């Protein structure tokens, strides 16, 4: 869809691999405001919004907090306290028809500036002069939208650009599994546990929903692994005086 009708999709309650997102393809623009790209996977937030729109190359710079222009004031606005990323790449191959692609349109003027994260869909005729116009376009009265001159022979400043903006607990990406060892005391960390000791097998019978196991004096003595549902024991490797 066009910039004047930018689509928004909500992401929640699923695992997102942020690092793989940059490695999927090549993006000419990748700017994150308030977000560290290195620690992109090291985040855990609640609400994710992916706003996307098509603009030309020269309008890419207007997609940032505290920016001014036709698109920034009439098509899409980013709040000054925006906490997210801006990703853009050229789309002159699949998103550029041969000869004045008229499918994409943009807004040129309005009665007031757009609030952040607000979309305008009205097609009311804009009154640009004292002479009134009632549903009729003409003198001092023009359509709020104009067609893009998307041509393959146009320069990179006018070439089409599809821009994806990511705006930010149920959204996080876990990793780092590892194999298992036996009959040798090591340092272990299951989901929410830590301690040192040796792990062997056991003959205890659990219940279909129990994970840990505690003896008297509140000390762990049995753990179930979350990969093969196999019981285990925990005894500490030796210590004593000299």
């Amino acid at each position, epitope marked *: *869809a*066009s910039v004047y*009708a930018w*689509n928004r999709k909500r992401i929640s309650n699923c695992v997102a691999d942020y690092s793989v997102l940059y490695n999927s393809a090549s993006f000419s623009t990748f700017k994150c405001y308030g977000v560290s790209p290195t620690k992109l996977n090291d985040l855990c937030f609640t609400n994710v919004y992916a706003d996307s729109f098509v603009i030309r190359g020269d309008e890419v710079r207007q997609i940032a907090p505290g920016q001014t222009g036709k698109i920034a004031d009439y098509n899409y606005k980013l709040p000054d306290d925006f906490t997210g990323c801006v990703i853009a790449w050229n789309s002159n191959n699949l998103d550029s028809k041969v000869g*004045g692609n*008229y*499918n994409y*349109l943009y807004r040129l003027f309005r009665k007031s500036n757009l609030k952040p994260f607000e979309r305008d*869909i*009205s*097609t*009311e005729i804009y009154q640009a002069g004292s002479t009134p116009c*009632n*549903g*009729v*376009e003409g003198f001092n009265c*023009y*359509f709020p*939208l*104009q*067609s*893009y*001159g998307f041509q393959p022979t146009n320069g990179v400043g006018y070439q089409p650009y599809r821009v994806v903006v990511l705006s930010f607990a149920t959204v996080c990406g876990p990793k780092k599994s590892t194999n298992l060892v036996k009959n040798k005391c090591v340092n272990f960390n299951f989901n929410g546990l830590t301690g040192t000791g040796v792990l062997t097998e056991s003959n205890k019978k659990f219940l279909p929903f129990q994970q840990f196991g505690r003896d008297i004096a509140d000390t762990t003595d049995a753990v179930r692994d979350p990969q093969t549902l196999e019981i285990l024991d925990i005894t500490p490797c030796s210590f004593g005086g000299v």
Partner: nanobody
Amino acid sequence: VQLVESGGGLVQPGGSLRLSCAASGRTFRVNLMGWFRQAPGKGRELVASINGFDDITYYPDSVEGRFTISRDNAKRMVYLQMNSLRAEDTAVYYCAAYDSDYDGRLFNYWGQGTQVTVSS
């Protein structure tokens, strides 16, 4: 390019009515139609607007919850289903076809128009 409008006669308040117009001739650069309303004592007004490229329809607050617009790309058809008709809807309905110049300025084609009356 020629806009021919069909349908729309005399109806009763609280009824339903659908209007369809066909565009034939030169292919339009921009996929954008619309419906207009001209009251006998007032000027042209906005009823609905559909793009098709984005599949997003816009309605004014006056008829946001009563007027629905649909399009048929294969037959070059557009439809405007009118529900919960009131006495204020008695006007002539027009069809608009939007085209663009080489520079990019959007044009507009005005149809013949169909008279719609809501009488008890």
